Design a protein around this ligand. Structure first.
Ligand SMILES: NCCNc1ccc(C(F)(F)F)cc1[N+](=O)[O-]
Length: 455
């Protein structure tokens, strides 16, 4: 309701962050204002604005900035923003200078240190991937002089020390289940020799830990599909590669069982493991098995599926329904169950890949489209903010290592391995055969399942 005297600022030629706002360097949305886009200089200016604090923009920026700015560039810009020159003395030469220091220099310099604090607290992986970046930040933070900023400086270093350093159960976990293979002899571990309960438990723990380690920045900008995927998305790729190898493992176990009765038992055991996956709300494991039975080499084995117990076939059909109609039943099932759970990552990745292709990276000079990043950060934010629980199950390390190091493809490549599985599928059940041919049983152990009831 009143316009006060404007602050006397340095020239834009000496401090490029005070260049005047224009639709050619920054754009806002008509919905604290909401930034639609701009130059990275204008984005940094609003990231450390002097008039107000903007924690939502800080959180969103530090999650998404790798899609439009490198971590080294971000640090340089923040340091450049910190080193604010004072305006050249008036043509007559202190009232404007005292005002400039209290209302502009101190607020901006404190906003930058808050950005540093959020950066090292919530995204220290940047400094683990780039040690030169961390030594630049420590060198700059040491050179920071001022008693008002000492609390901030020692707070940043306190967090860095914590990050440079780096189970227990609420209720007693149930005992580990063993079938034919016994503790220690990892060389004999296999789908049918291990216990179906414990296969599902150990893969559920493994897939829960893999899922928990994925951070939003590994998804922003689809960086897991681009040139630097191994560096920017190491946890997400481990999640994708585990799911690929486990899906191929279930397919291999079925098709390589040439004896018909052995193959029906193998498929039956897999449906039992699926049964425990559903008990544990492990939807990743459920859809791993559905993907395997939907492979062309397994799906065509009509004699195998028709020999199943009707109860086990209805369990499998129930799980196949989860994915039908664009995962309609899966979405309402996930919303209804309670944690601990392991949601399916695939639907999230397609959501993000679809908005990445729809929205443009840029909005005179081409300006970074930050609204696109805010939309992508809102998808990942819904994943991060789900209140999930750790599983109350004990880890068996040898089984864990067995599932970690599963390599079903052997020496063959992707297309060669699918050719091998489809040719083997045609051998064990030929096209238009009246009954499956008889093959010798390769297992020297019984295929009777111990069930999925514990104790
Ligand atoms: N930190 C655990 C929660 N976060 C999380 C988990 C999984 C995924 C994905 F994509 F793999 F499905 C993505 C995220 N995310 O981006 O938040």
């Amino acid at each position: 309701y009143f316009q006060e005297q404007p602050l006397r600022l340095p020239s834009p030629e000496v401090y490029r962050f005070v260049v005047k706002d224009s639709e050619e360097n920054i754009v806002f949305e008509d919905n604290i204002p909401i930034i639609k886009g701009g130059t990275v200089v204008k984005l940094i200016e609003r990231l450390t604005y002097h008039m107000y604090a903007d924690p939502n923009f800080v959180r969103t920026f530090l999650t998404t900035y790798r899609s439009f700015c490198k971590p080294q560039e971000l640090l340089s810009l923040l340091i450049e923003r910190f080193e604010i020159p004072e305006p050249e003395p008036t043509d007559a030469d202190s009232a404007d200078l005292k005002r400039f220091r209290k209302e502009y220099v101190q607020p901006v310099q404190l906003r930058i240190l808050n950005v540093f604090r959020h950066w090292v607290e919530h995204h220290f992986y940047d400094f683990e991937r780039d040690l030169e970046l961390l030594e630049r930040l420590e060198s700059f933070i040491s050179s920071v002089r001022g008693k008002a900023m000492k609390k901030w400086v020692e707070s940043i270093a306190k967090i860095i020390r914590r990050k440079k350093q780096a189970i227990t159960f609420e209720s007693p976990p149930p005992p580990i289940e063993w079938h034919i293979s016994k503790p220690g002899q990892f060389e004999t571990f296999d789908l049918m020799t291990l216990h179906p309960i414990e296969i599902a438990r150990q893969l559920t723990l493994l897939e829960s830990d893999l899922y928990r380690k994925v951070q939003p920045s590994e998804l922003v900008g689809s960086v897991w599909t681009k040139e630097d995927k191994e560096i920017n998305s190491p946890n997400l790729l481990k999640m994708i590669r585990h799911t690929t190898n486990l899906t191929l493992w279930f397919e291999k176990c079925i098709v390589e069982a040439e004896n018909f009765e052995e193959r029906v038992a193998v498929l039956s055991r897999i449906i039992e493991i699926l049964q425990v996956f559903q008990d544990l709300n492990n939807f990743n494991g459920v859809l791993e098995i559905v993907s395997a039975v939907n492979s062309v080499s397994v799906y065509r084995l009509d004699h195998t599926f028709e020999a199943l117990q009707e109860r086990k076939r209805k369990i499998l059909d129930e799980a196949v329904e989860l994915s039908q109609d664009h995962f309609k039943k899966y979405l309402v099932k996930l919303k209804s169950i309670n944690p601990p759970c392991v949601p399916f990552f695939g639907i999230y990745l397609t959501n993000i890949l679809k908005t990445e292709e729809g929205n443009n990276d840029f909005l005179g000079k081409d300006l970074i489209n930050f609204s696109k990043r805010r939309k992508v950060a809102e998808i990942t934010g819904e994943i991060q903010q789900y209140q999930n629980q750790p599983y109350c199950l004990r880890i068996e390390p040898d089984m864990r290592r067995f599932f970690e190091n599963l390599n079903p493809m052997g020496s063959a490549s992707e297309k060669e391995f699918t050719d091998y599985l489809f040719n083997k599928s045609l051998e064990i059940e030929p096209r238009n055969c009246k009954q499956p041919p008889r093959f010798p049983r390769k297992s020297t152990f019984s295929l009777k399942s111990p069930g999925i009831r514990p104790n």
